[PDB]
Every structure is written in C-alpha cells, then in structure tokens.
Amino acid sequence: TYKYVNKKEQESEVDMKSATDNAARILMWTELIRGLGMTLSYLFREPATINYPFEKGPLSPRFRGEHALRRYPSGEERCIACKLCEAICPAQAITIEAEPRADGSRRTTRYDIDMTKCIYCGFCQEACPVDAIVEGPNFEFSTETHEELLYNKEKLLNNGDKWEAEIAANIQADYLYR
Amino acid sequence: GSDRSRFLEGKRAVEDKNIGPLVKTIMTRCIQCTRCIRFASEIAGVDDLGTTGRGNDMQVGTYIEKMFMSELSGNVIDICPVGALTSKPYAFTARPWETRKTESIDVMDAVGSNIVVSTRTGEVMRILPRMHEDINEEWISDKTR
Amino acid sequence: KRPTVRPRSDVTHKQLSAFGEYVAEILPKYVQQVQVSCLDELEICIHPDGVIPTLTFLRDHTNAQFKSLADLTAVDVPTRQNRFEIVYNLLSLRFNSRIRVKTYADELTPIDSIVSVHIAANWYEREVWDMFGVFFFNHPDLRRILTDYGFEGHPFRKDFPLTGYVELRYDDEVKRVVAEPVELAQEFRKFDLNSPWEAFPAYRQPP
Amino acid sequence: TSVKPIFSRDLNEAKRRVRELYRAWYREVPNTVHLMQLDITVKQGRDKVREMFMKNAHVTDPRVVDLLVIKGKMELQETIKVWKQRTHVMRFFHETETPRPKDFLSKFYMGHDP
Amino acid sequence: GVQVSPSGEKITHTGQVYDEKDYRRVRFVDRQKEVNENFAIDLIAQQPVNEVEHRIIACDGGGGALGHPKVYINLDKETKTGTCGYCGLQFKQH
Amino acid sequence: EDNKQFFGRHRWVIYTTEMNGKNTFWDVDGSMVPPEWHRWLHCMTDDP
Amino acid sequence: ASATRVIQKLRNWASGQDLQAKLQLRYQEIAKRTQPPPKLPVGPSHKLSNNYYCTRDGRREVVPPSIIMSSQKEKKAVTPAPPMKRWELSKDQPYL
Amino acid sequence: QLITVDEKLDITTLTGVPEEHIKTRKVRIFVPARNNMQSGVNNTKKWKMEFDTRERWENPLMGWASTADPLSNMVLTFSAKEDAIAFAEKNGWSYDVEEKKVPKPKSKSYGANFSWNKRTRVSTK
Amino acid sequence: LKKTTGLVGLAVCDTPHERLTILYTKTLDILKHFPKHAAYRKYTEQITNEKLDMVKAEPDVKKLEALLQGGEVEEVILQAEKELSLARKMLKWKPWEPLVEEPPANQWKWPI
Amino acid sequence: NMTLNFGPQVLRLVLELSGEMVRKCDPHIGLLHRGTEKLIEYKTYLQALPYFDRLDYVSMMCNEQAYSIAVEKLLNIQPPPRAQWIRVLFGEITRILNHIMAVTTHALDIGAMTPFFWMFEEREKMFEFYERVSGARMHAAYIRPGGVHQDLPLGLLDDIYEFSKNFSLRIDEVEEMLTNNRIWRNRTVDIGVVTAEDALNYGFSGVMLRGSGIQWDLRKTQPYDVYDQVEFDVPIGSRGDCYDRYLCRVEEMRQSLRIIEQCLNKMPPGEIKVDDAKVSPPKRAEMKTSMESLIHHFKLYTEGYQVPPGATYTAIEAPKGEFGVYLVSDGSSRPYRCKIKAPGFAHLAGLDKMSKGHMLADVVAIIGTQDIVFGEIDR
Amino acid sequence: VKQDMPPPGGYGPIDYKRNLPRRGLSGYSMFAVGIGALIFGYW
Numbered sequence A: 001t002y003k004y005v006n007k008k009e010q011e012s013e014v015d016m017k018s019a020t021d022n023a024a025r026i027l028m029w030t031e032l033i034r035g036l037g038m039t040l041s042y043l044f045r046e047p048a049t050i051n052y053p054f055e056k057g058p059l060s061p062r063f064r065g066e067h068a069l070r071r072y073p074s075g076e077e078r079c080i081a082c083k084l085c086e087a088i089c090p091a092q093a094i095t096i097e098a099e100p101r102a103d104g105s106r107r108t109t110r111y112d113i114d115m116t117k118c119i120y121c122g123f124c125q126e127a128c129p130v131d132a133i134v135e136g137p138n139f140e141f142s143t144e145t146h147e148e149l150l151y152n153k154e155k156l157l158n159n160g161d162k163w164e165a166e167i168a169a170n171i172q173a174d175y176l177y178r
Numbered sequence B: 001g002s003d004r005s006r007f008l009e010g011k012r013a014v015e016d017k018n019i020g021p022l023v024k025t026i027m028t029r030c031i032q033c034t035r036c037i038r039f040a041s042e043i044a045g046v047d048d049l050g051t052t053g054r055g056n057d058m059q060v061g062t063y064i065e066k067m068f069m070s071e072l073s074g075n076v077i078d079i080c081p082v083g084a085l086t087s088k089p090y091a092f093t094a095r096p097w098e099t100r101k102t103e104s105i106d107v108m109d110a111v112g113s114n115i116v117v118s119t120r121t122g123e124v125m126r127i128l129p130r131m132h133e134d135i136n137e138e139w140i141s142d143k144t145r
Numbered sequence C: 001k002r003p004t005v006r007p008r009s010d011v012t013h014k015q016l017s018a019f020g021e022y023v024a025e026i027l028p029k030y031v032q033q034v035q036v037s038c039l040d041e042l043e044i045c046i047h048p049d050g051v052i053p054t055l056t057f058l059r060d061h062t063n064a065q066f067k068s069l070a071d072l073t074a075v076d077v078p079t080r081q082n083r084f085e086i087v088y089n090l091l092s093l094r095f096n097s098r099i100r101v102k103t104y105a106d107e108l109t110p111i112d113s114i115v116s117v118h119i120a121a122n123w124y125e126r127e128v129w130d131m132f133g134v135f136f137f138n139h140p141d142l143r144r145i146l147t148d149y150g151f152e153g154h155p156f157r158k159d160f161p162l163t164g165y166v167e168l169r170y171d172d173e174v175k176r177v178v179a180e181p182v183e184l185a186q187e188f189r190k191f192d193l194n195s196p197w198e199a200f201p202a203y204r205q206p207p
Numbered sequence D: 001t002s003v004k005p006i007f008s009r010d011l012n013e014a015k016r017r018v019r020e021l022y023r024a025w026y027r028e029v030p031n032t033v034h035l036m037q038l039d040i041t042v043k044q045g046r047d048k049v050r051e052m053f054m055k056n057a058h059v060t061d062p063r064v065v066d067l068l069v070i071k072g073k074m075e076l077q078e079t080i081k082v083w084k085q086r087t088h089v090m091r092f093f094h095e096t097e098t099p100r101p102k103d104f105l106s107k108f109y110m111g112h113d114p
Numbered sequence E: 001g002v003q004v005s006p007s008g009e010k011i012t013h014t015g016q017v018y019d020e021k022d023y024r025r026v027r028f029v030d031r032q033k034e035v036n037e038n039f040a041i042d043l044i045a046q047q048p049v050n051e052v053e054h055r056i057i058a059c060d061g062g063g064g065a066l067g068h069p070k071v072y073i074n075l076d077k078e079t080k081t082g083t084c085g086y087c088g089l090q091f092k093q094h
Numbered sequence F: 001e002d003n004k005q006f007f008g009r010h011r012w013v014i015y016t017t018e019m020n021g022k023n024t025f026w027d028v029d030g031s032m033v034p035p036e037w038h039r040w041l042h043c044m045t046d047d048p
Numbered sequence G: 001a002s003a004t005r006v007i008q009k010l011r012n013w014a015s016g017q018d019l020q021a022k023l024q025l026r027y028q029e030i031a032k033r034t035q036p037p038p039k040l041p042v043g044p045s046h047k048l049s050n051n052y053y054c055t056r057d058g059r060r061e062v063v064p065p066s067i068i069m070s071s072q073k074e075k076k077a078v079t080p081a082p083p084m085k086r087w088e089l090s091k092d093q094p095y096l
Numbered sequence H: 001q002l003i004t005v006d007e008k009l010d011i012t013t014l015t016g017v018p019e020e021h022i023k024t025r026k027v028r029i030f031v032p033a034r035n036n037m038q039s040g041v042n043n044t045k046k047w048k049m050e051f052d053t054r055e056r057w058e059n060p061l062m063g064w065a066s067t068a069d070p071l072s073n074m075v076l077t078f079s080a081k082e083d084a085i086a087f088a089e090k091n092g093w094s095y096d097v098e099e100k101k102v103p104k105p106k107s108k109s110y111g112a113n114f115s116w117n118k119r120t121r122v123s124t125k
Numbered sequence I: 001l002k003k004t005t006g007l008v009g010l011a012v013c014d015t016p017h018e019r020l021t022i023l024y025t026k027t028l029d030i031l032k033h034f035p036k037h038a039a040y041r042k043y044t045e046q047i048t049n050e051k052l053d054m055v056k057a058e059p060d061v062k063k064l065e066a067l068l069q070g071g072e073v074e075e076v077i078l079q080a081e082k083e084l085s086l087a088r089k090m091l092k093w094k095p096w097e098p099l100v101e102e103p104p105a106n107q108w109k110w111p112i
Numbered sequence J: 001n002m003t004l005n006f007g008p009q010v011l012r013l014v015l016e017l018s019g020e021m022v023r024k025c026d027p028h029i030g031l032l033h034r035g036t037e038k039l040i041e042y043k044t045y046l047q048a049l050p051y052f053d054r055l056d057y058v059s060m061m062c063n064e065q066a067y068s069i070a071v072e073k074l075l076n077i078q079p080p081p082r083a084q085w086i087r088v089l090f091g092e093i094t095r096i097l098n099h100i101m102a103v104t105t106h107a108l109d110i111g112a113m114t115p116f117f118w119m120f121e122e123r124e125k126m127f128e129f130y131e132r133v134s135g136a137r138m139h140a141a142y143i144r145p146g147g148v149h150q151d152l153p154l155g156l157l158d159d160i161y162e163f164s165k166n167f168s169l170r171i172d173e174v175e176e177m178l179t180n181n182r183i184w185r186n187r188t189v190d191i192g193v194v195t196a197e198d199a200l201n202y203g204f205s206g207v208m209l210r211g212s213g214i215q216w217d218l219r220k221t222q223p224y225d226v227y228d229q230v231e232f233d234v235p236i237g238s239r240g241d242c243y244d245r246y247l248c249r250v251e252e253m254r255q256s257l258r259i260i261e262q263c264l265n266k267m268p269p270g271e272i273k274v275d276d277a278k279v280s281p282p283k284r285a286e287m288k289t290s291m292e293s294l295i296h297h298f299k300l301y302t303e304g305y306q307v308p309p310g311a312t313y314t315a316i317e318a319p320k321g322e323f324g325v326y327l328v329s330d331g332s333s334r335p336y337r338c339k340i341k342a343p344g345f346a347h348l349a350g351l352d353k354m355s356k357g358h359m360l361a362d363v364v365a366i367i368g369t370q371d372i373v374f375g376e377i378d379r
Numbered sequence K: 001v002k003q004d005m006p007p008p009g010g011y012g013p014i015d016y017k018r019n020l021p022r023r024g025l026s027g028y029s030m031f032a033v034g035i036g037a038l039i040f041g042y043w
C-alpha cells in the first residue's frame, strides 16, 4: 500500500490570498520564528543530564562487563577444564592449560584472558555448564597500561570473591529466562 | 539418535576398579560392548578380564584387584570408544580439537610403528597409533606410547 | 503440518524450471549446467565467452527484465584447473524474482566485463582484481581499492593466510611507519572440528 | 600448449610493453623524491627499479609478463597521482631488517632455518 | 593459606615460583604479585563428610539447578569415601 | 533516594572523605561503590 | 512536572502542542523492577510419544538440486514467475 | 589466436610471497588417517596439503605460544592427488607425498568362534 | 487527463499506440533476418504479435496498461527499444549455434 | 585543476575541482577493511554473528536477522511465531535507530546540531531495551539461527508502549524545525537528482529507489517473515531529491510505529528457539538433568551445527536496502564463503554521477542521503 | 502457572500520525499591522 510524499493533491491556484501568504512567509520568516519558539520550549524544560560518579545509569541483571570466575558455597572452584569457553570464544582470546590436582580432582593451572580481544559477547557464560565464569556488571576497570588487561586465573578468582555478593542475585533472577 | 530423553527416572552407578598405574578406570560408563574382553582373550592371551553378573548390575573387570599390565595394555584405551578406560598420564591435560596432529614413527623398537603425535601450543601431549595394514595394524606398544 | 519445517512448494520449482528450459533452448551455446535448487533458486553456469550475451539477453528480453545486479561475487576452489567461480546475483521487478549466473575462470585466464550494461560492476570488478587475482578487460579504472596502495598479493584466496605476511609499526629511528615480517605473540589456534560420522547420506560420493 | 593469450602473443611484444614501462618509471622517480620529501638518491631509486625488474627474469610466459606489467602500471598510476606516501614507497627497502644471513653458519648460530 | 619462597615471592596455589636466577621477576619490582589466599584444596578438606543410607546417591552441587549436572555415585566400597568429580564433596554409606 | 524525580537521578550517593588510607575529598572515582549496594544503585533492583 | 503552571503554558504556546501528556522523562510510568520469578512454556516437541525424529528431520528432507541441460546429461513464451501485482494507495494519508 | 607453449606453469611472482617462505617450505600431500579413538571414515576421503612445521616458542610475559611463520596453520583440501600436485608445482613449492594406506578385506565367519577343531574357539560370551 | 507519470527521466507521451506499432513492426521486420530454427525468433515473434493485438484491441492507455500488465506505457516503449537493440546484437552474435567448448568434468561438482 | 583531498571534520575523497564547482569525486575506500570474509571461513556458524552485528553497525539486528534467515533457508527449518514477531519488533526499532542517525548526522554535518542531542535521549531508551533483553547496549548477540536466545523479561512491553506514545511528538517537534525551513529546503532541493533507469542500473536500493517514484520494498515483495500479516504503507517520492529522501525516512519512522502497535497487540505466547536440539541449544535445566541434551550442548558449542552443502542469496529491507548474503557451504560447520552485499558500495558507485555539476558543499548532503556507513562497505 | 510476558486483551492506540498544527494568522493582517506601526513611527 504505497503513498505519495512531496506532491500536491492537484494543481495549485494563483489566488492573491495564497500569493500573499507566500510573500509573508518569505519576508517575515514565520517558520524560522516557529523554530526559535521550539528551541525556547526545550530551553525551559528539565535536562536529562545526571552526575555520573554520584548517579549512575540504569541497567538490567543481564549485563556483560568485567569477568569473574566463581565458587561453590564450599569454597571450591567451579571450572573443571571443559574448554567450551575456549572452543566457542569467537576471538580465540582464552588460553587454557589444565592438569590434575594432588587431591585427585580435575582442575586448571592456566585460565588466561585477553580483555583486549574479548568482545564481551556472552558465549562463555552460556556454554559453561556449571555457571563458573560469568561476565559481570563492572565496567569501570579502565587502566593506564596494556598489561592490566591480560587477566589470569588469580585476578579472575579475586574478582569473583569480590563481586559474588551481586552475581548470585543477578543470576538467581536471570537463570529462569534461559 | 534423537534430540532428548524420555527418561524421568533414576540412573545407576558402579564401583571403580584399580587395574594399573596406566589405565584409569571409570566403570559407570561401560555400555558393555566387550571390545576389551575379546581384544584381551585373543591378542594378549591374558585371559583375566570378563563379565561378572546379569542384568543392569553387570560389570566388566576382574573379580579381584589384579593388575592388567602387559606390553600391549595401552590399546584398550584407543579401543574403548568411551572414556571409561582412559590414560592416566594424558588425562586432565588437554582435548583433541585443540591439537595439531602431526605424523611420525617409533624408535623404541625396530618395527616401524606409524604414529600420530598430538601437539598443543608447541608441546607434545599424547601419542596415537596410525593404521598401517602391514607393520603395526592399529596396535602399538605401551613403551612407545 | 509440522512446525519446524518450511513448506517445499511446487509453483517455484516448476516455473523456474520452465524458464531454465527456455533459456537453454534459446542459448544452446554459452550455456551448460542449468539447475534449480531444493530451496527455490535458479543457477545457470556458462562459458566466459558468453557473459555479455547472456546478461544483455536477461536485461532486455521482456520476459526476463533481470535489471538490477544485486551482487557480483567470486569463489575459490583450488581442486580444479579453472579454480575461480564468478557469480552474478540478479533481480527483476515486474516478475519479482532473482537468479544466479555462474562462470568459471582461472588465474591467467581473464574475463569479459559487463560495465557496458550493469555499471555496478565497475567496482565489484576492482574488488575482484584486488583480492583474488582475476582480471577483466575493457575496464577503465582497475586498481587496488580495499587494500593498501602498496599491498601485494591476493588475500581472499585460500592460500594467502589469515594473519598475512607483514605487520606494521613505528620506529623512531627513522620516524616513519614501516612494515616488517609477521612475528605474532599468540599463535592462531586452528581447531580440528570436522567430525567423521556422516550425517548427509544423500550428498555422498562413492570411490 | 593450446591455450588462450592475454594482451599479447609473444615475449617480444611483452618486452616492448615492459620497456615502455621502464621508460615511465625512469622518467618518473625524480618527481616522487621531489614531491614527497624523501631522502634517497635518484640513482638508488633507479637501482631499486632495475632490481625489481631483474628479479623476474626467469620468466617465459607472456601471460605472466603481461599481468606483471598490468600491476606495475597500476602502481605507477598510484604513485604519480600521489596516493602512496613516504611510507608506502619506502616500504620496499627493508630499511628495518637485518639482511637474512645466507651464511650457513650464521643461520646455525642464530636460529633453526636450514 | 599462602606460603613463601626464599626470595619472598608468594607461592601460588599451583607451585608457580620465579627462582633467584630468573629475569622475569622485574615486573614485580615497585609492584605486587596478585594471588588468592583461599586455597580450594584446604577449603574442601575442611568440609564434613556427608553420610547416607541409600547406597547410591545423586549429587547436583547445591541449588537444584545452578550446580553440576546430576551425577549418581555408588558407596558400597566401605574401605573409603565416594567423591563427586565436579564439586569435590564426598559421601559415605551407613 | 528521592522517588519524585525522573529516572537515573532518583538515587544517588555521597562518597567518603578518606577510603583505605587515602584522601578522597576531591579525588573521587566510581569504583568506590561496594557491590551489595552497587547493584541497586545501577537500577538493577529495588530492595536495598 | 515539578515545574510551574505559567512555564507550562509558555512552553506549550511556544511549541504548539501539549507536553505534560507526552513528556520524554520517566516519572514512575514504567514497570517496577524486582519482577517476580517466572515460569516458562516449552514447544510442541516436549511430548513423550509420536515425536520420532525421522518425521521432523528438518535438515535431511533436503535433496540435491535437479539439473537441466547439462553438457552430458510448439511452445509458449514463459517467464521465471508471474508478474508483480500493481499496488494501490492507502486509506489513511496517501498524500504526504 | 591460441598459443603453442609447452612450458610448465609458475605464478610464484603474482602470488606475492618472499623467497624464504616459498623455497624453504616443504609441502606435504597426504590423507589424514583416522583418529583411532573413533571409528569414522568421512575424514579419509580427501587429500590434504600441509606445510612442514617451524619454530613455535613460548612468550616470556605470560607463556603463550607464538610463531614466526604464518603458514603453519594453512591446511588445504583437495579431491585428487593429481590436482593437488598441479596446484603445488604451480605455486612452485617442493611437494612430498604420503600415499594411501587403505584397509584390507576380511572374512568374519562368526560361527567360527563356536568351532570344534579350530583354535579360534573363544572361552567367553 | 494527466500531468506526469510518477517517475524521473520520463515524459508525458501524447502519441501512444503509434510509437508502439512502429517499434513492434520494426522488431518483426528485423526478425525476418533470423533463421526459423532460432528460438529467439520463435518466441518474441508471438510475444510482439500479442502485444500488437492488445494495443489494437484497447485504444485507451489507462486500460491498455493494466491489460498488458507490464509497467507503464513509457516503460513498455523503453523495453521495446531495448529488445530491438538486443535483436540487432544477437544478429551479430551467433548464439543459436551449438555450444562453444565444453568444460572439464569436475567443475560444476558441489560438494568437492 | 585544484584537485584536492577531503577527510573528516574514513571519508577519504579526492575532488577533481574546477573553480568552485565540481568535475569529479573519486572516493578512496579501504580505510576500514579488516578481514571479515577471510575470518569467517575459519570459524563456525555461531561465532560469526558478531561480524554481522559489526557490519552496518547502527542497526546490527536487521543484519543478525539476515544471517539467521540464510542459515535457516540452508537448514530447511523455520523458527516459531514468538521469535518471528520479536524479530520484526527489533527490526523496526533498528529502522528507527538508523533513520535517526542518518537524519541527525545529515543535519549536523550541515550545522544544525540540536535534533541530534534531542533524539539521542530516545536512542538511549532503545538501548535500555537492548540491555534489558540481550545484556549489552548495542552489539547484542540476541538474534540467532534456530530462533532467539532468551525470552522477553516481564517489564519490557509496557516500556515500549510508553515510548511509542511519545516518539511521534518528538518526530513532529523536529519536523517543525526542518521539514519547512527554507534553509534546509535550499540545502537539499534539486540535489542528488537521479533517474530511475540509471538508479536500477547502478544498483541502487531501498530509499535511493523509492524516492525516485519506483515501488520496491522487499517486505511487501519477497516477504521473509510475518511482514505479510501486518499493515504498513510504503512512502515514495516523485522528484528524486534529498528532500524527498529525507521525507521518506521520516514517513518510515512513522509507519514503523504503525507496525509496532500491532506487533504488541498481537504478540502470542509460545517458545523462542525451535525445539530441534541439534541446531539450537536447550534449556539449562534439561542440559543438566538429561543426557542427550547435554551431548547436543557439547557438540553445538565445540563443533557448530553441521550444515548441508547448498548456496543461497537472501535479502532484507535494512534501513538502506538489499543487505544480501551469498553463503556457500560444504557439509561442514566451517563455511566456505560468506559474501556480504551492502548498498553503500553501489551508492558510492553512483556518487560520481549524482555529483556532476553541483557545488562543493553539496557532496556532504549527498552522503547524508546515502546514509554512508563504512563497516558494511569495506567488509 | 505459565508466565512469559504477554499483554492483556488490548493496548491503546498510538499516534503514527502527523499532528503538525496550523498556527498563525493572515498575510493581510500581518502586513497591515507592520505598516500601521510604520506610519505611527513616521508621524
């Protein structure tokens, strides 16, 4: 069902009245004045601005930012070197090197990330069958060097032991949807 | 196969056996194919492995804590399609797709066992046989592997 | 009917087959391997010595009116003598349809252009010459468009690797921005994924 | 054997075009090292030119010769209609690269190349 | 808890140490070496050994979901315990 | 909190002068928000 | 909204329209956060019977194409498909 | 029109690679034998071109594995040894082949397992 | 009647049916040059015959258009001119001849 | 002839001038090429989407949708109704985003910079929606083959309604400034005047066509989704100037709400991802309890879902036009070629003809009309 | 039980429309007003 823009329903007239209105709008600039009035309107309104460090924008529990490995309530880790994160990471960012553990269990020795390559997608927390790795909400980890961003197992563990008071609730809310 | 299970019921498990310092045994995964049994009773002339029971309670493995060590123990790994009889050294170290399987031979003996050498980030992780219908025929030695 | 399957209709697989027979009997020359896909599309393979005839026909003849060259493309398959496969995806409005023309080519076997007819190709051909290595006659301006103005090679082939041969960096010793050979930091992991067990017993190939 | 030609029929016509192209580059270089405030000498430039020519002298096929000619002409257009810059043009001299040691012992002591 | 090497470097939870002769330990100078103090091995050893009567038992890892997939364990081997690969917990038969 | 303003500005925070051996009367980041509050502050929930 | 009646009137005379009715900002005209834990449906494929995959294979109903006029393997004027049915204007605002 | 030139084709110039990465690179044309772990035979159908390997060291910073050569991970497919050889000798490399290792046929007279005079008689079931 | 068409680059043609007779007659007069065993002739002959029948059976354009069911009269004229040129060109080319040179065998074989 | 260069103030132009008017404009593309179609071949069908988000970076979802539809035409399946409807919804939201950015960057490069700052608040609202649903602001991985990733949280529809209740007033308040200002009328009118035959030939698409009288919309024709159900009137222009194009974009902004209203008032219940667990991963509860679903999870997320050897050419009515995909495939998860078709390509091919005889400060308005985005172009 | 965020039996109607108003006055009015002011000034 098409339409027609920039076209009159028919040929116009040569009425002195229409010519008069045209001349007026060409001289006294009615439309320009209307634009000025609109700017005045928005001037006299409330601005949507906010103070960042003292007010922070809205979000939803499904954010994707700084990373965080996790733990069971019993202190133990959750990663078992299933390598799905490595085989699905579109960027090939992750680097893993696994091993046994003196107690017989299975665990890692190297779980490194390059947050310069990580596009912050979500595939790793989708694949991890144990919800170990969870891309988190923290987006303030800008730095001054390109070596505070090649995170490793211990930095991820610290970030988990730090933010776990928030990721628990976020997931407890989000998991059902998935 | 299919796309899901219609099994809303409970599963089973089974004790694990010590069989040697090479062949890590989990035995809640044996689909009971008998490859190990036949391979042993025919090739290695061992005659110690076998099935003990009837019904789901069936198991596969010696009735005692005996050790199945032999110059050819170390191919049941490649033969058991499942990860029940895994290799203890390689275990927990890596996965296949990561690897760059190169191809080589053995020197531990003067036979000429064609071999697949698996790499990982510039390092060896495991060794596999390679099918030569004359020399090694999909079987190689504990030593070389 | 089933929910998780599109309907394999008949109207299209019949109409486009009729049109294929039509074009075939019109151009018993400059044509070979016509075909219709299982998903309502028409492909027409042709010798490179008939490109412009075919395109003029399909643009002009009323019953086709394949006006808009929605796309021009290349593909590389190295297991054959004529390894490149040039592709034109064309669109007609009156008859509300699309079509696909193919023609084989090879490095050291240039092709006849179509700029006289579809001026869109004036740039797709530049792309092709820059990336793959396939050449086109009667083309006014043919130069590296995408890559650098000094780049050398043909990347979109299957041999020119992903990482490429050279990297860049600034070297205060001369103040310029020089190109040195690739010495990466991490290696491009190549995951072996192709699983053996055959899933499609219909597209098989016997010894 | 029985194949199709490109722009030519024999090494001789290929070579007449090649000579035209040599003339172009020879008559051009000065304009480059005068427009883009380079450092090298016109003689060094012409040396690079003749070297990039000589390093394709194991050729027989007119098709190969003609494709090389086409690419050279593209690059010459690029240069004289100034798009390549100081960097684009000095990317040839490997000016930040230790000459690959061909001394077998050099290769031995340094790396793994045979 | 963490221990230390001759040179004062905090041993990791997996025995990583830069011996006295390695030049890769300049990055630490005027800086620190990040390490976690909570060692999983001790934190799982501390945990109590669970007890049951049904010889076979199903483990998930805490929450119904949110933990390791349902794995079923046998416990008839009275010589010792029965561990769960994912979570590390260990059960015993009554 | 002031739930009569518009969105994003109905919550806010006044930081601490000194935080972990430091003088932060002027110097002020956005990472000084502990998580159990951070979550609400960023409008993820409604119960502190 | 916290602003004054006179300023409302002024901005409205300026613009031409009303604003207190179609503000851009958001004063509790949203859905509360902390929503309740939901429960979800499933597809028509979570049955227990008559769900044999062979029926709905999906990516095996495919079959290779049907070649025509290969190199080894009266009538009417036809087209690739029927023509385009011309369109008509709208019932709402065809002009502008 | 056409030409009479019986010279072997070489496009090493148009290719765009240096002398080092064209000459010292020994190419290998083989068929990837099965992964014994599996029992699958939709891999031993093609003919694959790979290159010899090269230096693959460890980064000092973290421990990654780097490379000086880009081609290490350039694996190419083909459906025929003749075509693969054509491509290889065309690009100018030095090719070495690994011919086909094909299984044998066998006669599995199952009933033999339950024989009387033979030695095949198994002691299991 | 009308003021324009609805496109850009076109015209308010005030002499229809006449240009149409002209162009179609000329198409057929060129086709005369074509061997009868050429499908292009064998088809476009009848196509243009039917178009002529239609223009002669409908004198008013506002119905001739929707009857042809093609584009608008000006588009029809343009397309007829294009078919004319196509004919003049297929006359120099010899397409109706047999095939030029068959390809190798493993060319149109997908997969590979 | 005063031939000069021209850049920002990516867009590297070389103008062959004559005095003050123009004689030629040669763009120099390639300042944003990376290797998308040289990387994909070394990847699966589920770690490729990001590429199609990064392409035509404004919308990103009318692009994920193209990729999904191509993969589905290959796999001979269909997604469910809730998925199709959600996907239409976000398609329209992206139409809005792209139209907004084109309009406002036009007016900004010209100098009028207020509507930019005005409409960006509503854009932030749309990004809040993208966040509530996907997780990230812009480059959501939401739309995926076999359907969609997650369902819709229980606080979205109301917000969408409350936003559509006001977007129309904002559009009108910007029209008041622009669609009658003689200054804009004179900056745009009689510029980029094009004729239908040359448009078709050069390969133009979408707006660059239907602003020249033509009637071509790949949603009315070649309907790829439920777009056959709902009503939406297509706008067209008779002259073929930047003014007509601008007005087309605004009218589409409006008809998009005319669509969203019905999408909302008819969105059915149901599933999101087709229950064929060999293609789309399953829910986590089953992934954890059952076994076959876990195996399929593992395979999907190491070896992408196999695809049979075929070939297609899809198409969309993205904000600009025939976003196309020639996706070739062997019987493997790793494809063999993924040729994008982005209209900017032909738009540039036609710039050298739309800018013959016009002055120097009209190239900018031409580009504004063309809504040039370079991610889609370089590839 | 099942809850997946559908709407109720109907939402309100939206304005997909142009409300661009007709505001102002007549040209004769404006011109004569300006000119009357002009004449007062002159006098």
Ligand code: SF4
Pocket: A085, A088, A089, A090, A091, A093, A094, A113, A117, A118, A119, A120, A121, A122, A123, A124, A125, A135
């Ligand atoms: S979020 Fe995506 S890109 Fe980042 S580490 Fe996880 S899988 Fe890789």
Ligand code: SF4
Pocket: A078, A079, A080, A081, A082, A083, A084, A085, A086, A124, A127, A128, A129, A130, A132, A133
């Ligand atoms: S997916 Fe999770 S459990 Fe598996 S390797 Fe990655 S982080 Fe570890």
Ligand code: SF4
Pocket: B029, B030, B031, B032, B033, B034, B035, B036, B037, B060, B079, B080, B081, B082, B084, B085
């Ligand atoms: S080979 Fe493996 S699966 Fe087969 S019977 Fe032996 S243990 Fe069981």
Ligand SMILES: [Zn+2]
Pocket: E059, E060, E061, E068, E084, E085, E086, E087, E088, E089
């Ligand atoms: Zn457990």
